[PDB]
Amino acid sequence: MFDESGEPAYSALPYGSEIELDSGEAFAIYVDDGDPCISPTRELTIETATADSAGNERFLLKLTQTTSLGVVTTLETHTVSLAEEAKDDMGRLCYLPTALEARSKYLRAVVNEELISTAKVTNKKSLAFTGGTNGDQSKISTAAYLRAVKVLNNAPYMYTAVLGLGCYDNAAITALGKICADRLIDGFFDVKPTLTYAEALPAVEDTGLLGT
Amino acid sequence: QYSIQQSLGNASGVAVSPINADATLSTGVALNSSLWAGIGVFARGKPFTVLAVTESNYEDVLGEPLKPSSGSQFEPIRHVYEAIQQTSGYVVRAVPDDAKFPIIMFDESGEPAYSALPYGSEIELDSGEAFAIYVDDGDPCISPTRELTIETATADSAGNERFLLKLTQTTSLGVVTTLETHTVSLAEEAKDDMGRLCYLPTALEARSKYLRAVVNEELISTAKVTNKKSLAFTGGTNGDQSKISTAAYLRAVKVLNNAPYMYTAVLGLGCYDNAAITALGKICADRLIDGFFDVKPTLTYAEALPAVEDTGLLGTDYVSCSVYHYPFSCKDKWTQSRVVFGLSGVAYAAKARGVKKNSDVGGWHYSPAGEERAVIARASIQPLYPEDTPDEEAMVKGRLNKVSVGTSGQMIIDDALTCCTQDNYLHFQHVPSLMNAISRFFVQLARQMKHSPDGITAAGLTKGMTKLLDRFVASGALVAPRDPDADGTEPYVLKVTQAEFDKWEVVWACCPTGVARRIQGVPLLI
Amino acid sequence: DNYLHFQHVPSLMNAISRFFVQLARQMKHSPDGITAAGLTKGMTKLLDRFVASGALVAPRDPDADGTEPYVLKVTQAEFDKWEVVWACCPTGVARRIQGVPLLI
Amino acid sequence: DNYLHFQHVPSLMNAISRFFVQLARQMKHSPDGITAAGLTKGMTKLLDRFVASGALVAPRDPDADGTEPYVLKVTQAEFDKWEVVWACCPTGVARRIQGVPLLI
Amino acid sequence: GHNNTKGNRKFIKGRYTANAAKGERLVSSEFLLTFAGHEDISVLVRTSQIPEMTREDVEDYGPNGVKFNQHGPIRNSGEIQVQCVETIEGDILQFIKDRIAAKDYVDITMAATPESKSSGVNAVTKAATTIEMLDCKIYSDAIDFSTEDVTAAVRPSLRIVYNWIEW
């Protein structure tokens, strides 16, 4: 999170929650890739540039990636402006949210409309993201599986098979079976491989797919 | 080879302008198969007057499209652009009250004075002022500056004096271009080199589309004009166009109602006001015409159904009126900015495509929905509310039309229903359309039937009606009854009945063509 | 500025005037002599020939002006004064051309 | 910082402009009804030749623009004026190449 | 005699109205050739044609005697027969002499101009009935002169070969 005169601040938020800009902050830039920056770090550098034809200020935003041994690799560059009616050299618009949403793969931005009338940016180097974590992924509730199944149901793409991919959850399996029976496609599901021969048979009935 | 110039003057030569890094080239074409109408808010144009726009005039007439960052002021031009790719139409402009147009008054010595007045007001010349020049076109000169230049010219053959009036346009950057030039004389009886009159009001009314003039008769005689450099119009502004009261919309609707151009469709170009929508529907039902309207697109699926009932169209009075809902998002054509707007002018395009199939009577029996006729052509479609599913049966009960993805992959309008709750075969779009077309043809026949030696007579009507209905049967609109045993093989029945002597009655019945919308397959296994 | 500083515009009218003079000189030897009815048929024939040659073209704007290339009309005020007038729409020349390069 | 850095893009634009100027100079001072068709036909043929030679390619943004390498439009402006506009898409150049070694 | 006979004039009336629903039939005497830069010869043409507009066909004999005909590449070049009338000033002869003297390729536009679709003294053409040929070569033929043909006028025969058909 930046503010007037460009003083960065660092934070982290849960995936579901939306970003709210506190009073006295100009804009924020966050990683949309869904990737914690733990082992390969990611940094931002800001460099000012020449103003465009209309006289609006512009700058460059550059993203780099650093490994554990110190190797630095270049990822992306952009020409960005903080004014709504700002145009690039090629004729495209330079507004930060629109530019990041249109021509970027990792970053997204959110702007506060109250203070962008009087905001400034300075040259900064190597601002690294912190706080991005992946939680304990061995304990995931059935709500997440059901939500992702609902997302898969309304996918505008066309597919001809459904795969379990090691869910081993009865509700998710029967929801996937409902998807298969809805779209008239094939389904390949699996039961827990650690079960013995005697215990495998009741688990199939436990899945709920047996019938007509 | 030799030198190459950048701009042309008066010499004979070929000039090439410098390379432009960004610009767009557009090619147009004109057609007048079916004429539409609507109401919207735009940049420039004469307010509250009917304007005729074609594919090559919708940029000069009207104006440059408004930027989506302003908000809610950009939908009408997008709707007009979508609808105009088939045929031309008519548009009436609505403007807020706090709108003014610039005007320059000239003293007897020749000095200018600037001011502005509201569109409704009429110009009154103060004593001590000879003449004034204002802008007839409803174009504020805020971003593109317009300048006026005056210089003297050779006197007339009879001895009258005259001067050159030139109009120039300057952008914000500083690029200056020339718009118009004229030779005008303050004397009442003066003539041009080509023989035309040079009286300032008459000349401006005749051969100018930008400016007009008003003169003071008493003091016009002893007036002198001196050379002046560029003078810029000031004070011409448009109020916040995102806040338009219902009175202006109703005034524009009333202006549309009293027009003789005889258009064949009425469209709601991004107008989300209920009173204006009901008035437009009344116009639609008055003229025996089809009509297409739009509900607010940002509304969710649950809230859309009550919004249809909010408008007064749901009933038996307004037949052949359709309401569409389109909550998806797409990249804008002019600037790739991911805008959202409804489906008005896309349905009319499908109707026009269907009408173009037949050349004798039109073939109005084609329904607007379908995979071939109705296709939505937009850059990249992203749903606003994913993982949500509409209730199709509730939509059918609510007389709301739906959209779907076609076989090829593009979005398709998949249904066509009118705002008629009764089960009368009238909720299907084409059934009212056929009878409306036949009624219009009959009206034109009956208007021509009079002015004859015998006027309107029962014998005369039967012959013309038989010819008309035979033509409609030939076009394929009317078909034989499904059950030949119960009903006769004839597609239509025309009869005249007699009660007493002063009562006559002419009635014709028709069997409309069916549509194919529900198909079921039953698989078996041997 | 009368569309007259272009070379061909006076040339067409001078040729038509010479043809009219030659026609009127011959018509004077007719039994009746010079007559308003007689002066219309010949002028129509010569103007049709000039239209065929491509010298006269239809007006640029069909809405404002009629589609006909030339208008020949006879007006009478009182009985002593007659008047015969014809108007023409000359062909244009192409002398100024401009090209505008762009880049996608 | 446009597409005008590279030496070849202005070279293509200037070559097309010079060819257009020559073509226009060929058809100067001619009566009406001839110039429009000649201009459009010659310009289409010339841009087709440049497309065949490999100078122009399909645009890199198919959402904003179609699949056509070039477009053309010819109109008549005034009594003795013409205006022609065209757009075209240039060819890229290979300047910088990066390689990354890996070890199994 | 015949027991199957039955009259039905409603059906015939229906066929008559269906046939008359379409507008007109193009009379074969209404057409126009342009010949690109030589527009003065357009009057003297007396006969024209429309190109073949076909494709090559590929024959394959399948199992047993099964045979299938398949589309092939478009046919570009062909011949067109055109007849012109001759004046006493040798317009056609001079045209042919000039064409032979210098190797040229001339574009030819073929269009139909009915009287019904015309405004003023100028004919108007339609895109549907207009076809074009590019890179054509104009060749002459033997021209016959004879006495005792006092009622006839000399009519040269021209042979034109096109290299592309565009619409």
Side-chain angles (χ1 to χ4, degrees), chain B residues 222-257:
Chain B
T222 63
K224 296 297 190 293
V225 182
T226 59
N227 300 357
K228 299 277 158 36
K229 210 64 178 295
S230 61
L231 316 162
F233 295 102
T234 49
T237 186
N238 292 357
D240 49 345
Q241 272 168 330
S242 55
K243 324 312 211 203
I244 317 290
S245 65
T246 63
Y249 273 129
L250 291 185
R251 181 176 171 181
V253 169
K254 187 184 180 181
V255 166
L256 277 176
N257 197 5

Side-chain angles (χ1 to χ4, degrees), chain B residues 522-526:
Chain B
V522 179
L524 303 178
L525 189 150
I526 298 191

